[PDB]
Design an enzyme around this catalytic site. Structure first.
Site, PDB file in Angstrom:
ATOM      1  CE1 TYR A 195     -28.395 -11.343 -24.092  1.00 31.14           C
ATOM      2  CE2 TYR A 195     -29.523  -9.585 -25.026  1.00 31.14           C
ATOM      3  CZ  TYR A 195     -28.351 -10.230 -24.986  1.00 31.14           C
ATOM      4  OH  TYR A 195     -27.095  -9.273 -24.890  1.00 31.14           O
ATOM      5  CE  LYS A 225     -26.555  -9.052 -22.002  1.00 29.40           C
ATOM      6  NZ  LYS A 225     -25.059  -9.228 -21.219  1.00 29.40           N
TER       7      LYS A 225
HETATM    8  N1  LIG Z   1     -24.878  -7.394 -31.291  1.00 30.19           N
HETATM    9  C1  LIG Z   1     -23.776  -8.047 -30.387  1.00 30.19           C
HETATM   10  O1  LIG Z   1     -23.040  -9.223 -30.437  1.00 30.19           O
HETATM   11  C2  LIG Z   1     -24.689  -7.899 -28.899  1.00 30.19           C
HETATM   12  C3  LIG Z   1     -25.334  -7.596 -29.242  1.00 30.19           C
HETATM   13  C4  LIG Z   1     -26.045  -6.963 -27.333  1.00 30.19           C
HETATM   14  C5  LIG Z   1     -25.356  -6.915 -26.473  1.00 30.19           C
HETATM   15  N2  LIG Z   1     -24.318  -8.121 -26.406  1.00 30.19           N
HETATM   16  C6  LIG Z   1     -23.106  -8.632 -25.573  1.00 30.19           C
HETATM   17  O2  LIG Z   1     -21.975  -8.327 -24.726  1.00 30.19           O
HETATM   18  C7  LIG Z   1     -21.372  -9.044 -24.873  1.00 30.19           C
HETATM   19  C8  LIG Z   1     -20.273  -9.468 -25.267  1.00 30.19           C
HETATM   20  O3  LIG Z   1     -21.208  -9.535 -26.842  1.00 30.19           O
HETATM   21  P1  LIG Z   1     -20.676 -10.787 -28.157  1.00 30.19           P
HETATM   22  O4  LIG Z   1     -20.620 -10.895 -29.531  1.00 30.19           O
HETATM   23  O5  LIG Z   1     -18.732 -10.626 -27.989  1.00 30.19           O
HETATM   24  O6  LIG Z   1     -21.566 -12.332 -27.345  1.00 30.19           O
HETATM   25  P2  LIG Z   1     -20.378 -13.557 -27.420  1.00 30.19           P
HETATM   26  O7  LIG Z   1     -21.251 -15.013 -27.555  1.00 30.19           O
HETATM   27  O8  LIG Z   1     -19.172 -13.504 -28.804  1.00 30.19           O
HETATM   28  O9  LIG Z   1     -19.586 -13.728 -25.789  1.00 30.19           O
HETATM   29  C9  LIG Z   1     -18.986 -13.110 -25.282  1.00 30.19           C
HETATM   30  C10 LIG Z   1     -17.367 -13.916 -24.501  1.00 30.19           C
HETATM   31  O10 LIG Z   1     -18.136 -14.471 -23.082  1.00 30.19           O
HETATM   32  C11 LIG Z   1     -17.409 -16.093 -23.095  1.00 30.19           C
HETATM   33  N3  LIG Z   1     -18.156 -16.586 -21.682  1.00 30.19           N
HETATM   34  C12 LIG Z   1     -19.602 -16.917 -22.187  1.00 30.19           C
HETATM   35  N4  LIG Z   1     -19.609 -17.304 -20.943  1.00 30.19           N
HETATM   36  C13 LIG Z   1     -18.753 -17.397 -20.301  1.00 30.19           C
HETATM   37  C14 LIG Z   1     -18.925 -17.190 -19.070  1.00 30.19           C
HETATM   38  N5  LIG Z   1     -19.899 -18.330 -18.237  1.00 30.19           N
HETATM   39  N6  LIG Z   1     -17.546 -17.094 -18.510  1.00 30.19           N
HETATM   40  C15 LIG Z   1     -16.206 -16.711 -19.184  1.00 30.19           C
HETATM   41  N7  LIG Z   1     -16.460 -16.142 -20.137  1.00 30.19           N
HETATM   42  C16 LIG Z   1     -17.841 -16.406 -21.270  1.00 30.19           C
HETATM   43  C17 LIG Z   1     -17.550 -16.187 -24.842  1.00 30.19           C
HETATM   44  O11 LIG Z   1     -15.663 -17.390 -24.528  1.00 30.19           O
HETATM   45  C18 LIG Z   1     -17.125 -15.103 -25.573  1.00 30.19           C
HETATM   46  O12 LIG Z   1     -16.545 -15.242 -25.935  1.00 30.19           O
HETATM   47  C19 LIG Z   1     -22.678  -9.956 -24.684  1.00 30.19           C
HETATM   48  O13 LIG Z   1     -22.631  -9.490 -22.819  1.00 30.19           O
HETATM   49  C20 LIG Z   1     -23.535  -9.700 -25.078  1.00 30.19           C
HETATM   50  O14 LIG Z   1     -25.034  -9.702 -24.645  1.00 30.19           O
HETATM   51  C21 LIG Z   1     -23.639  -7.883 -27.953  1.00 30.19           C
END
Ligand SMILES: NC(=O)c1ccc[n+]([C@@H]2O[C@H](COP(=O)([O-])OP(=O)(O)OC[C@H]3O[C@@H](n4cnc5c(N)ncnc54)[C@H](O)[C@@H]3O)[C@@H](O)[C@H]2O)c1
Ligand SMILES: NC(=O)c1ccc[n+]([C@@H]2O[C@H](COP(=O)([O-])OP(=O)(O)OC[C@H]3O[C@@H](n4cnc5c(N)ncnc54)[C@H](O)[C@@H]3O)[C@@H](O)[C@H]2O)c1
Lengths: 247, 244, 244, 247
Positions: A152, A156
């Site tokens: 990760y 990122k």
């Molecule tokens: N506290 C947090 O949740 C947090 C913190 C830091 C970064 N992020 C980043 O924010 C973004 C979204 O956050 P999140 O909590 O909704 O994570 P999440 O696991 O819910 O992923 C968001 C959506 O992306 C979809 N997805 C996964 N792989 C895919 C693919 N190949 N093609 C199309 N869709 C796909 C999933 O169906 C999901 O609905 C991510 O990139 C995550 O890395 C989140």
């Protein structure tokens, strides 16, 4: 504002991506709901259309180039342009270095880093044609490094370098490329946890409170705004101060 | 989030900040050294319907700054937003840097904003809401023939982040907008054409560009964004190491 | 036959730096506030075979600094290496910070090293060789209850990089070693285990750790390394945004 | 120093990697020469042992996990330990965004980013047992972003995030993880240029001079030193100041 702009948010059928799409639609944008989950796509498209929003479902694995191109084609056929791209789709496999499978690595890189590259590539030519584009990549506080998060953090951090490289390259075409690095955000995972988990992380928050998806949506609305054309190449943390010291 | 003080409001960026914030219904207090320019600005803003007061002051000594702040608090009863626009500083090669050039840069470039933050942050934490936006520029990262400017501006980086962490729990945020190259209509067209070429978006920045970013950080909803160094530079900050 | 001036040599870090450079045959000049401590250190270094002079000074005013510099250059005829070890600064919550606390932090933490650089950098460019190493600490990044320290230390970031670019063509390098948590044998044992737990290598840093980094940057062969902010922190800097 | 430490330098059969191995061996280290070019491995291994150095050739594609594991096994069979790993093997496919083939992306990521992950993973367990390791990754000034370098900037930026993540994770085991970001370095390509080009680039160098391979070798010698155990998680530029402003 972003009135009458067309916004593609990858992975926006659930989570903060969905909340970003909702707020975008509410501020006058046509939004493309994307996910690999075709049923989550339909449910959100249905939900948004019922709310009166201009919305299109585009099911595609953003990690697959052919699927990405079909999404971009479906978006262009429907709305004729793509003004905003939010590379929100992401995932993680974590674990001690020794316990990380080659597959744990390949997929985290593929979805987060290559996927962001594939969507940005497939979309940018349309923004060049319109001499206007907003590309915002969702990275993470973890690009600064997280124990047990080699894949990760690598992916990122790669998104951060891509943001800087393309901000330089695409700026002359009227395209800005920015990155949002969320800290800790109130999520469905969080609500499905036991108390003791919760209370450790909160204690690591300078504000003492959790960030909410709207915090991300509101920050993204700023970067995507028609008025933010001179903002590019940026990494903006939405962390409540945690990114200043995460130890 | 109704009251805002703009320090060094008496320049084109300060004007643009005042217009953006007034546009969102914020009551304004404009501090600056040029009373003539300050009053003309207040007159225009009132003429358009904005609530505004002016406070002439060319001060960098702490006591005088606290006084300025008290005037604002006397009129409005609170300061929800502090925007410190930077004061002009002379960039010069090291040999041309005198003993007093050093002290002045630190006093106007670094000590003065610190004193404003000391005078306002306690109030903000007590009221449970605060938005502090420091306006700096790319010289804080260090360029040739800017050492006295770089030393002063560079101090704001740690200062803002230190107080961001110190005040976070009480609803206060402290952020920095770093200006790139801003058009001014006194710059020669020949230095605009040269400068624009070195900027990825191939245009100079406008004061409105700066105010747009300031307005975002000062918004009530930017409550989870703090400690940030946000460049408004057309991409030129991507050429510097350590800007991310 | 290389000459180095160590400002604030009168502490454990200054001692270790002096020992590392003496080990490489460098002729030494030690500046510091505690003449007693300086003489003992010079005595030990001379006893080991090092060429060394001492110069007592608790100054932050430029003229006094320029003089101290003159003493050294009288003895050795040139200064090839300048190491500015930081002087102690007290971090305190914002309310406890007075008007003089601000000025003093800036004077010793930022103005004083600036003055040393102004007195030495021109000479180095003339001779075509120079190695400047600024020693700072993690508070330059800004932490809660350190605002007065952070403002001063943070100024060295832009300052060092500014002069690095200004002097690059004349064989001079300007770099910064940022100290993490260093053991001192006056911290409570409970604060050693507490601090060490928060450091990825799970131990506090030693003065020798810092000198090793200073010695690298000051080496003749580090001619292509300049403008750097090198943390010697056991990994703790990896928890900060903007440390890279 | 590094006397009798074992150093595996990826991509060290030619170029800067080759020269780092030579300087490492001269300071008392056992060096593993690796490359995909088996003839350059043999010639360089031949060169080094002739100079009296303790050297082993290990031909392997760093992008292939099985090849990496066989490399590390051969190194352990030969020297019994791996004290130092320099992830120097790298490459670049460059071009405007629209002109980048999917393969241009996949290979740049695979060699630079995944390759560095594979070697670090395969080696680190041996350093854990010995309670000592030095991992140094070769990134680039271009991790800060370079026009026409989306894959390289992405890959090398990912190396920076990996460096930070593993510096945090592996520190307790006595392993430091650092990164060197070379600026402009005199390379055989450099001599393949016309003066008019050359004099433009130099003029953008603050020192006005080119960096040489020894500049990297010496910085790498510092980070690898027994005395540098408290330096970890760092990105150290060897750029003559160009990294301070590359515009
Ligand atoms: N506290 C947090 O949740 C947090 C913190 C830091 C970064 N992020 C980043 O924010 C973004 C979204 O956050 P999140 O909590 O909704 O994570 P999440 O696991 O819910 O992923 C968001 C959506 O992306 C979809 N997805 C996964 N792989 C895919 C693919 N190949 N093609 C199309 N869709 C796909 C999933 O169906 C999901 O609905 C991510 O990139 C995550 O890395 C989140
Ligand atoms: N001036 C510069 O050359 C410069 C500048 C900045 C960064 N860098 C980086 O420093 C490192 C070395 O620089 P260089 O100019 O000597 O590069 P180079 O390509 O000339 O040498 C790298 C060697 O690694 C070999 N290699 C081993 N395993 C490989 C694999 N799986 N796939 C592909 N190649 C493999 C290659 O055959 C090659 O010989 C690279 O990582 C480069 O990205 C170089």
């Amino acid at each position: 504002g972003i009135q009458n702009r067309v916004a593609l948010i990858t992975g926006s059928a659930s989570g903060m991506g969905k909340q970003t799409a909702l707020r975008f639609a509410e501020q006058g944008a046509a939004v493309v709901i994307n996910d690999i989950d075709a049923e989550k796509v339909r449910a959100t498209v249905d939900e948004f259309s019922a709310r009166g929003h201009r919305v299109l479902g585009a099911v595609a694995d953003i990690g697959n180039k052919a699927a990405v191109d079909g999404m971009v084609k479906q978006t262009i056929d429907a709305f004729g342009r793509i003004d905003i791209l939010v590379n929100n789709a992401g995932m993680e496999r974590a674990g001690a270095l020794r316990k990380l499978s080659e597959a744990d690595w390949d997929v985290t890189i593929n979805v987060n880093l290559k996927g962001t590259f594939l969507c940005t590539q497939a979309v940018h030519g349309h923004m060049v044609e319109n001499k206007h584009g907003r590309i915002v990549n969702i990275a993470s506080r973890a690009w600064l490094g997280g124990a047990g998060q080699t894949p990760y953090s690598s992916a990122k951090a790669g998104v951060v370098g891509m943001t800087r490289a393309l901000a330089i390259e695409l700026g002359r075409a009227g395209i800005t490329v920015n990155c949002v690095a969320p800290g800790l955000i109130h999520t469905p995972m969080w609500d499905e946890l036991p108390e003791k988990d919760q209370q450790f992380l909160l204690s690591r928050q300078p504000t003492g409170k959790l960030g909410e998806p709207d915090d991300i949506a509101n920050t993204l609305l700023f970067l995507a705004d028609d008025d933010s054309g001179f903002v590019t190449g940026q990494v903006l943390y939405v962390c409540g101060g945690r990114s200043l010291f995460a130890g | 989030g109704k009251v805002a003080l703009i320090v060094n409001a008496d320049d084109a960026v300060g004007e643009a900040v005042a217009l953006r914030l007034a546009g969102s219904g914020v009551q304004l207090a404009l501090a600056g050294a040029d009373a003539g320019r300050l009053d003309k600005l207040a007159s225009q803003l009132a003429g358009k319907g904005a609530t505004v007061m002016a406070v002439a002051t060319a001060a960098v000594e702490a006591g005088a700054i606290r006084d300025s702040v008290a005037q604002v608090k006397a009129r409005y009863g609170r300061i929800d937003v502090l925007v410190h626009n930077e004061s002009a500083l002379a960039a010069k090669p090291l040999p041309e840097i005198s003993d007093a050039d050093v002290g002045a840069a630190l006093d106007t470039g670094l000590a003065a904003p610190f004193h404003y933050l000391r005078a306002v942050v306690p109030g903000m934490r007590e009221a449970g809401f605060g938005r502090v936006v420091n306006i700096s520029d790319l010289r804080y990262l260090g360029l040739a023939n800017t050492s006295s400017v770089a030393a002063a501006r560079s101090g704001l980086f740690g200062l803002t982040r230190a107080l961001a962490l110190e005040s976070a729990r009480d609803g206060v945020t402290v952020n920095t907008v770093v200006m790139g190259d801003v058009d001014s209509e006194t710059t020669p067209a020949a230095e605009r054409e040269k400068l624009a070429g070195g900027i990825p978006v191939k245009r100079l920045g406008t004061p409105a560009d700066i105010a747009n970013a300031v307005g975002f950080l000062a918004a009530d909803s930017s409550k989870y964004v703090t400690g940030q160094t946000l460049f408004v530079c057309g991409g030129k900050s991507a050429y510097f190491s350590m800007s991310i």
